[PDB]
Amino acid sequence: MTTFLIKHKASGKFLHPKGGSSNPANDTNLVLHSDIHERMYFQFDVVDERWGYIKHAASGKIVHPLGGKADPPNETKLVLHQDRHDRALFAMDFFNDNIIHKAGKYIHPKGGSTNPPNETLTVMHGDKHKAMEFIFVSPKDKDKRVLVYV
Amino acid sequence: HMTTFLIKHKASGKFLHPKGGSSNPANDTNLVLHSDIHERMYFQFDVVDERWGYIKHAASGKIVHPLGGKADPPNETKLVLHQDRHDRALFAMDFFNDNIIHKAGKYIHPKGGSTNPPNETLTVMHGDKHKAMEFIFVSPKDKDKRVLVYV
């Protein structure tokens, strides 16, 4: 209904909390993995027009740049954390197919590969290219895009 | 719930209106650009399927259609309001690239493509992308404040 999968467009892998738990601890890395299950479902909670929080559905933790700085440098790891604040604001660009942080960098697989192996970490990086594209799909139809602004 | 908004032509600051400004425009009334602001030029976006939805005139419930109801309208097809609701009136409101795209892939343009068209200029479909076909979606109470049309 409000849940979606975050699919890495080039590989078909998905974003997961590292370890696949329903209850990841604060500062758990966000990784890529091929598996599908309810513990990799996400929601998006709108805060201000396009900006909002990317939320792990099972735990309520949201996506942060590790350390929570307003303008994180390239290669800053993405983690899950319960805190809510303006440095965890992202927009879900379903027209250009990417996820952009409030300060202008994007979510990437670490290393920028179109075919990242399972457990690859995700990081912030300012470049735009095929390997940083993501689409947002229905849990019950992994090829059907869904509106995350809901 | 559908957020109410103005459709603002980015280059000129003018807005999309039904020609003549009626609260209940007749079927096939042209969609035009005009500088006035009033509640008969407010719009809503009725989401149908993910990004696709109907651009709905708030006062009347009529929606934007390429005239003729063809599946793949050619360049220069005029935009009108009509009460009919079906898939050939599906658009997406691209608030990241700032344009309005039809399901068959062309965009809403001012007829003639001017960055600064006169009041009452018709709108048409066209495949080209440039500054004169950009639109932003703003609060009726603050024409410079972008609002999220998808909620």
Short mmCIF file of all heavy atoms in Angstrom, two decimals, chain A residues 111-132:
data_model
loop_
_atom_site.label_atom_id
_atom_site.label_comp_id
_atom_site.label_asym_id
_atom_site.label_seq_id
_atom_site.Cartn_x
_atom_site.Cartn_y
_atom_site.Cartn_z
N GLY A 111 31.63 2.27 -5.04
CA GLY A 111 32.42 1.81 -6.16
C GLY A 111 31.78 2.05 -7.51
O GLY A 111 32.47 1.93 -8.55
N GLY A 112 30.49 2.34 -7.54
CA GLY A 112 29.83 2.79 -8.75
C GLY A 112 29.59 1.75 -9.82
O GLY A 112 29.44 2.11 -10.99
N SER A 113 29.54 0.46 -9.46
CA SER A 113 29.39 -0.59 -10.45
C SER A 113 27.94 -0.75 -10.86
O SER A 113 27.03 -0.64 -10.03
CB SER A 113 29.89 -1.92 -9.87
OG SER A 113 29.71 -2.94 -10.85
N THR A 114 27.70 -1.00 -12.15
CA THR A 114 26.38 -1.43 -12.59
C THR A 114 26.02 -2.85 -12.12
O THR A 114 24.84 -3.21 -12.17
CB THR A 114 26.25 -1.33 -14.11
OG1 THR A 114 27.30 -2.07 -14.72
CG2 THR A 114 26.28 0.11 -14.59
N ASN A 115 26.97 -3.64 -11.64
CA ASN A 115 26.72 -4.99 -11.16
C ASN A 115 27.36 -5.20 -9.80
O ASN A 115 28.26 -6.02 -9.64
CB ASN A 115 27.22 -6.00 -12.18
CG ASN A 115 26.89 -7.43 -11.80
OD1 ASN A 115 25.83 -7.71 -11.21
ND2 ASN A 115 27.80 -8.35 -12.13
N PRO A 116 26.90 -4.48 -8.78
CA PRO A 116 27.50 -4.63 -7.46
C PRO A 116 27.14 -5.98 -6.86
O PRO A 116 25.99 -6.44 -7.00
CB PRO A 116 26.86 -3.49 -6.65
CG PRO A 116 25.57 -3.19 -7.37
CD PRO A 116 25.75 -3.55 -8.80
N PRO A 117 28.06 -6.65 -6.20
CA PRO A 117 27.71 -7.91 -5.53
C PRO A 117 26.85 -7.68 -4.29
O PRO A 117 26.77 -6.59 -3.71
CB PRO A 117 29.07 -8.50 -5.14
CG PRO A 117 30.02 -7.37 -5.16
CD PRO A 117 29.51 -6.42 -6.23
N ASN A 118 26.18 -8.74 -3.91
CA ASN A 118 25.43 -8.70 -2.66
C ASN A 118 26.30 -8.19 -1.52
O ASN A 118 27.50 -8.51 -1.43
CB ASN A 118 24.88 -10.08 -2.34
CG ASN A 118 23.64 -10.39 -3.12
OD1 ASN A 118 22.99 -9.52 -3.68
ND2 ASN A 118 23.32 -11.68 -3.19
N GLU A 119 25.64 -7.42 -0.66
CA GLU A 119 26.27 -6.76 0.52
C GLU A 119 27.14 -5.44 0.24
O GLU A 119 27.83 -4.75 1.10
CB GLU A 119 27.12 -7.68 1.39
CG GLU A 119 26.39 -8.94 1.84
CD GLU A 119 25.23 -8.58 2.73
OE1 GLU A 119 25.39 -7.65 3.56
OE2 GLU A 119 24.17 -9.22 2.63
N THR A 120 27.11 -5.04 -1.05
CA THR A 120 27.79 -3.78 -1.38
C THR A 120 27.18 -2.62 -0.59
O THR A 120 25.96 -2.45 -0.53
CB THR A 120 27.72 -3.49 -2.88
OG1 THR A 120 28.47 -4.51 -3.58
CG2 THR A 120 28.38 -2.15 -3.22
N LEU A 121 28.05 -1.83 0.03
CA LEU A 121 27.55 -0.68 0.78
C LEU A 121 27.03 0.41 -0.16
O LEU A 121 27.36 0.44 -1.33
CB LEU A 121 28.69 -0.07 1.61
CG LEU A 121 29.40 -0.94 2.67
CD1 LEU A 121 30.38 -0.10 3.46
CD2 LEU A 121 28.46 -1.66 3.61
N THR A 122 26.23 1.31 0.37
CA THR A 122 25.85 2.51 -0.38
C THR A 122 26.48 3.74 0.25
O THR A 122 26.76 3.79 1.47
CB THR A 122 24.33 2.68 -0.44
OG1 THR A 122 23.80 2.76 0.88
CG2 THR A 122 23.69 1.51 -1.20
N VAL A 123 26.75 4.74 -0.59
CA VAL A 123 27.44 5.96 -0.17
C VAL A 123 26.82 7.13 -0.91
O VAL A 123 26.19 6.98 -1.96
CB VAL A 123 28.98 5.94 -0.48
CG1 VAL A 123 29.73 4.80 0.24
CG2 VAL A 123 29.22 5.85 -2.04
N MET A 124 27.08 8.32 -0.40
CA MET A 124 26.74 9.55 -1.09
C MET A 124 27.82 9.91 -2.11
O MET A 124 29.02 9.83 -1.84
CB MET A 124 26.67 10.71 -0.08
CG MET A 124 25.56 10.56 0.95
SD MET A 124 23.92 10.34 0.28
CE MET A 124 23.85 11.68 -0.89
N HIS A 125 27.39 10.35 -3.30
CA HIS A 125 28.35 10.83 -4.28
C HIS A 125 27.67 11.81 -5.22
O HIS A 125 26.49 11.66 -5.53
CB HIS A 125 29.01 9.65 -5.05
CG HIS A 125 30.24 10.03 -5.79
ND1 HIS A 125 30.22 10.73 -6.97
CD2 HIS A 125 31.54 9.79 -5.52
CE1 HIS A 125 31.45 10.91 -7.40
NE2 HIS A 125 32.28 10.34 -6.53
N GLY A 126 28.41 12.84 -5.65
CA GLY A 126 27.77 13.87 -6.44
C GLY A 126 27.56 13.53 -7.91
O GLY A 126 26.79 14.23 -8.55
N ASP A 127 28.23 12.51 -8.43
CA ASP A 127 28.13 12.21 -9.86
C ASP A 127 26.80 11.55 -10.19
O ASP A 127 26.11 11.00 -9.33
CB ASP A 127 29.32 11.33 -10.27
CG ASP A 127 29.52 11.23 -11.83
OD1 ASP A 127 28.93 12.06 -12.57
OD2 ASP A 127 30.29 10.32 -12.22
N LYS A 128 26.35 11.72 -11.45
CA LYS A 128 25.15 11.08 -11.98
C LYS A 128 25.56 10.18 -13.13
O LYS A 128 26.28 10.63 -14.02
CB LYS A 128 24.17 12.13 -12.54
CG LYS A 128 23.05 12.52 -11.61
CD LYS A 128 22.02 13.37 -12.35
CE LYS A 128 22.67 14.65 -12.85
NZ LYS A 128 23.24 15.55 -11.77
N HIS A 129 25.12 8.91 -13.10
CA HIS A 129 25.48 7.92 -14.12
C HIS A 129 24.56 6.72 -13.94
O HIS A 129 23.80 6.64 -12.97
CB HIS A 129 26.98 7.60 -14.14
CG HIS A 129 27.56 7.01 -12.89
ND1 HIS A 129 27.63 5.65 -12.67
CD2 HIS A 129 28.23 7.58 -11.85
CE1 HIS A 129 28.27 5.41 -11.54
NE2 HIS A 129 28.63 6.57 -11.02
N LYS A 130 24.64 5.77 -14.89
CA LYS A 130 23.69 4.65 -14.89
C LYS A 130 23.66 3.87 -13.56
O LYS A 130 22.57 3.46 -13.11
CB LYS A 130 24.04 3.73 -16.06
CG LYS A 130 23.05 2.63 -16.24
CD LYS A 130 21.65 3.14 -16.44
CE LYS A 130 21.43 4.08 -17.60
NZ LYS A 130 19.93 4.34 -17.75
N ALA A 131 24.81 3.63 -12.95
CA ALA A 131 24.87 2.81 -11.76
C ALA A 131 24.30 3.45 -10.52
O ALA A 131 24.23 2.76 -9.49
CB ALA A 131 26.33 2.45 -11.44
N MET A 132 23.87 4.72 -10.56
CA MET A 132 23.24 5.31 -9.39
C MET A 132 21.75 5.50 -9.58
O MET A 132 21.09 6.13 -8.75
CB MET A 132 23.97 6.59 -8.89
CG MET A 132 24.24 7.62 -10.00
SD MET A 132 22.78 8.36 -10.73
CE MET A 132 22.38 9.64 -9.50
#
